[PDB]
Amino acid sequence: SSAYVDSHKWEAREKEHYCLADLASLMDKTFERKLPVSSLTISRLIDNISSREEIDHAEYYLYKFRHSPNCWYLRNWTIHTWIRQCLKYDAQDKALYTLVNKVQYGIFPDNFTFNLLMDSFIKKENYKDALSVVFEVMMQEAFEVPSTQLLSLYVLFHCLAKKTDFSWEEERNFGASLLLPGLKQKNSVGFSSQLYGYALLGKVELQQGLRAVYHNMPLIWKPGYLDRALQVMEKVAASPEDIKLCREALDVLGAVLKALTKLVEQLDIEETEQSKLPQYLERFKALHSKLQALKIESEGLLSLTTQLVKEKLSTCEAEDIATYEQNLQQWHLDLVQLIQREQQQREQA
Amino acid sequence: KAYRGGHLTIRLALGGCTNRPFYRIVAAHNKCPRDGRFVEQLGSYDPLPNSHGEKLVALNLDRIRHWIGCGAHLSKPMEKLLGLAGFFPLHPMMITNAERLRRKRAREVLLASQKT
Amino acid sequence: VRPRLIAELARRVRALREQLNRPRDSQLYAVDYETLTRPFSGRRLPVRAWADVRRESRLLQLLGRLPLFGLGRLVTRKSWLWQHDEPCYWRLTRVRPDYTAQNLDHGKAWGILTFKGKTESEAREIEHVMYHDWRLVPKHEEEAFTAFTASVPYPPLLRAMIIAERQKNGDTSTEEPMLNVQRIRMEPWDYPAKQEDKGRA
Amino acid sequence: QPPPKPVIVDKHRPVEPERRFLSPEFIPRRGRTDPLKFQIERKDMLERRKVLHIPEFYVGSILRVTTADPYASGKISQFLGICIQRSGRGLGATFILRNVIEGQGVEICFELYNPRVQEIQVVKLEKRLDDSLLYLRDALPEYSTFDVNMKPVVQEPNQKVPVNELKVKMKPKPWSKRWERPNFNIKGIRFDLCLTEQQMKEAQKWNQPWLEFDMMREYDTSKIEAAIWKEIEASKRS
Ligand SMILES: [Mg+2]
């Protein structure tokens, strides 16, 4: 989707044409007198940047703005000015660095901007960068967007192309990321990916407890993830169509390997998950048998099904472009008034 | 001496020579000393028994209600004495102490019956 | 009468100086996790919060991982939800982090709150922001989580007092006296307080 | 997380490049003698310069010096002070420093080529309109009192010499040198308060305008300093 990716309006719309050195010296003076500064200066700077060391200056001054008296404003149009200025001048190492330590820089792209970023990632054909980036988007929890199809494709292709047997951080990241893209209640792919994510989350819990489930991850504290997976399976069997994949075999493997032979957050009356493993496994066998008695092809590769998602992808990209141009119009609306605001100070002077 | 902040408090003042305590429920400030000045003497209490064996205590109900309606915090020991009197609810710590003593006495009787 | 000026001089000078160069909120909230002592104070922490400060992080440390510190995003009072099965949260309205903080892990933020589904129409101030007992609820399972649905006799001596009084008045009034308990809204301990009313070093 | 690193680039073209500056002690004095002396002592101090840096400075600049002293804490002596003057030529060229501490005004005369000194540092690099700052004695102590552990004020790598245009108040009239006379041609001080119209009208009597109009006493330096640059460049190449 070259038309969906590229955009000449953003590149040839509202350029300031001020001196980069002048803006740098101004920002240096303002942040040496440690008084607050508007985002208009940073926006003009970013629009004026045309160089690598200039984007480096921009990264340093963005760190300074994060550590400046004002941090909450978080103007997404300035964020996307910076994103374009970085990605067109090809600093993916620095883009990824900022995106991973967002707490250090605080970049937060929206649906269309991030979809453009991930389309550039597709064009360059890299996997690990996109993987870390989709983990950071899982941290963001922003999936109710037209980029949900892109996120689903990414996760469902990378979990298959991973071929990594042992990594607890990575496995928890996958198990937590496989939920939010599928929450839009789409089809078999959707709720079965939700099922597999529930399975991975229960596995991570049973293997390293419930602490990391919520400590450095936004998630719910109900330990019965296996129970929730069983609930999903039984409600699906009760209810449409269920195109299935052999990841139920991975679920079987996890369940069997867990059935195989300090603070206590668990409640005394309710028994512990270690003691619940048995009935978990009996119910899992029972629901396996129910599903096979009820869809059961388990041959259609999920990554191949994501090209049929290209239909709704190409359908929703239009509304995404519409939202992006609406955002551009809103930005041109508010920014011209913000310029008159800066002129108010000179009128007073 | 005008104490900053603070609040009126009816509490126990100590009197009498050593080995003969005599308490006096009296209205005073929170920052007030033990036997420092007061505003109005309300009542008195003898923690020792008389010839009859009973112990002495006096309460000025009208003035106490006056001071409460005017606003004043109270001390746990005298509020416990009030709850024992009946003008005031009984003390939860009193209930707990009674229950502890009764459990301990039952335990002692059990140990005696075991030894015998 | 002889006046004195240096008193007010030093008073207002100290006022200006301390209000200018007061210790930063992040600076004085910082904690070293192996010794469990706040710098600039040399005080130890309570045994009940030792483990929570060792393990769990702070509110702004949680909010630094998402845009705008999650306006409307669900953070629940860990203490309230451990003390009661009902859901309790904070309708965070305004936020302001501390610029001097390195990780932007401290600041002030508040809005409307709710306790056992008792939502208040007042965007008032939070309490105990700096504690390590903050829990973020995602944007899923959130509606399911937030889903939620006489009198006593007087004391014996006092009722006897009133009996004697009304008997002297002349009426029989066999009815037993009572008071309002449904009016008296006994509030639990964990009801929040006024951050601005409580001071600061 | 690692910390970011600062970067600053301001590139107004005809400001950044400065080219030339010679040391005030390389050039010889008007006196007559064979230049062999000059060149031999010069190459001596230059193959010493290959070790020691002498960070360039001016009068009124603040220098922090560390030296190896026999009798001192750690056998080292560290002293900060403002540049009053640079006197002498050749190896014996020295510079004067001064500082007010504990209410006492102390000053040092440093040899900038003695091996006893370990190294030099420029805390600040500036220039006073006056070539000689000896009147800082009679000046107020608040002008000379400087901090010892103040960090070096960062200076650009290639920029012009900052010249502070200021003037200084002074102790009352009972001075030792009579700075008010026009023989010294000094401007940092303020007649308007240090004296009256009568005193300045009486002191300008000794004024002799013809000194600067004379042209047989002046010392040309162009070809001399040219040879100086030439031979220092030769020593650097070799
Ligand atoms: Mg003399």
From Swiss-Prot, chain A:
InterPro entries: mS27/PTCD2, Pentatricopeptide_rpt, Ribosomal_mS27, TPR-like_helical_dom_sf. Pfam families: MRP-S27 (PF10037). It is found in: Cytoplasm; Mitochondrion. GO terms for cellular component: cytoplasm; mitochondrial inner membrane; mitochondrial small ribosomal subunit; mitochondrion; nucleolus. Keywords: Coiled coil, Cytoplasm, Mitochondrion, Repeat, Ribonucleoprotein, Ribosomal protein, RNA-binding, rRNA-binding, Transit peptide, Translation regulation, tRNA-binding. The keyword Ribosomal protein applies. The keyword Transit peptide applies. Overexpressed in hepatocellular carcinoma tissues compared with adjacent non-tumoral liver tissues (at protein level). Ubiquitous. One of its GO terms (molecular function) is tRNA binding. PPR repeats lie at residues 75-109, 110-145. Its main location: cytoplasm. One of its GO terms (biological process) is mitochondrial translation. Residues 317-349 form a coiled coil. Component of the mitochondrial small ribosomal subunit (mt-SSU). Mature mammalian 55S mitochondrial ribosomes consist of a small (28S) and a large (39S) subunit. The 28S small subunit contains a 12S ribosomal RNA (12S mt-rRNA) and 30 different proteins. The 39S large subunit contains a 16S rRNA (16S mt-rRNA), a copy of mitochondrial valine transfer RNA (mt-tRNA(Val)), which plays an integral structural role, and 52 different proteins. Interacts with NOA1. Interacts with MIEF1 upstream open reading frame protein. Interacts with METTL17. Belongs to the mitochondrion-specific ribosomal protein mS27 family. This is Small ribosomal subunit protein mS27. It comes from Homo sapiens.
UniProtKB/Swiss-Prot annotation, chain B:
Residues 1-25 form a transit peptide. It is found in: Mitochondrion. Its main location: mitochondrion. GO terms for biological process: mitochondrial translation; translation. GO terms for cellular component: cytosol; mitochondrial inner membrane; mitochondrial small ribosomal subunit; mitochondrion. The keyword Magnesium does not apply. GO terms for molecular function: structural constituent of ribosome. Keywords: Mitochondrion, Phosphoprotein, Primary mitochondrial disease, Ribonucleoprotein, Ribosomal protein, Transit peptide. It comes from the Eukaryota. Belongs to the bacterial ribosomal protein bS16 family. It is linked to Combined oxidative phosphorylation deficiency 2: A mitochondrial disease resulting in fatal neonatal metabolic acidosis with agenesis of the corpus callosum. Component of the mitochondrial small ribosomal subunit (mt-SSU). Mature mammalian 55S mitochondrial ribosomes consist of a small (28S) and a large (39S) subunit. The 28S small subunit contains a 12S ribosomal RNA (12S mt-rRNA) and 30 different proteins. The 39S large subunit contains a 16S rRNA (16S mt-rRNA), a copy of mitochondrial valine transfer RNA (mt-tRNA(Val)), which plays an integral structural role, and 52 different proteins. bS16m has a zinc binding site. This is Small ribosomal subunit protein bS16m. The lineage of its organism: Eukaryota, Metazoa, Chordata, Craniata, Vertebrata.
UniProtKB/Swiss-Prot annotation, chain C:
Keywords: Disease variant, Mitochondrion, Primary mitochondrial disease, Ribonucleoprotein, Ribosomal protein. The keyword Ribonucleoprotein applies. Signal peptide: none annotated. GO terms for molecular function: structural constituent of ribosome. One of its GO terms (cellular component) is mitochondrial small ribosomal subunit. Residues 168-201 are annotated as: Disordered. InterPro entries: Ribosomal_mS34. Residues 184-200 have a biased composition (Basic and acidic residues). It is found in: Mitochondrion. GO terms for biological process: mitochondrial translation. It is linked to Combined oxidative phosphorylation deficiency 32: An autosomal recessive disorder due to deficiency of mitochondrial respiratory chain complexes, I, III and IV, and characterized by delayed psychomotor development and neurodevelopmental regression. Additional variable symptoms include poor or absent speech, inability to walk, and abnormal movements. PANTHER family: 28S RIBOSOMAL PROTEIN S34, MITOCHONDRIAL, SMALL RIBOSOMAL SUBUNIT PROTEIN MS34. Component of the mitochondrial small ribosomal subunit (mt-SSU). Mature mammalian 55S mitochondrial ribosomes consist of a small (28S) and a large (39S) subunit. The 28S small subunit contains a 12S ribosomal RNA (12S mt-rRNA) and 30 different proteins. The 39S large subunit contains a 16S rRNA (16S mt-rRNA), a copy of mitochondrial valine transfer RNA (mt-tRNA(Val)), which plays an integral structural role, and 52 different proteins. Belongs to the mitochondrion-specific ribosomal protein mS34 family. This is Small ribosomal subunit protein mS34.
UniProtKB/Swiss-Prot annotation, chain D:
It is found in: Mitochondrion. The modification Phosphoserine is found at residue 23. Keywords: Mitochondrion, Phosphoprotein, Ribonucleoprotein, Ribosomal protein, Transit peptide. One of its GO terms (biological process) is mitochondrial translation. Transmembrane segments: none annotated. GO terms for cellular component: mitochondrial inner membrane; mitochondrial large ribosomal subunit; mitochondrion; nucleus. GO terms for molecular function: structural constituent of ribosome. Belongs to the bacterial ribosomal protein bL19 family. Component of the mitochondrial large ribosomal subunit (mt-LSU). Mature mammalian 55S mitochondrial ribosomes consist of a small (28S) and a large (39S) subunit. The 28S small subunit contains a 12S ribosomal RNA (12S mt-rRNA) and 30 different proteins. The 39S large subunit contains a 16S rRNA (16S mt-rRNA), a copy of mitochondrial valine transfer RNA (mt-tRNA(Val)), which plays an integral structural role, and 52 different proteins. This is Large ribosomal subunit protein bL19m. It comes from Homo sapiens. The lineage of its organism: Eukaryota, Metazoa, Chordata, Craniata, Vertebrata. The gene is MRPL19. The chain holds residues 55 to 292 of 292 of the full protein.
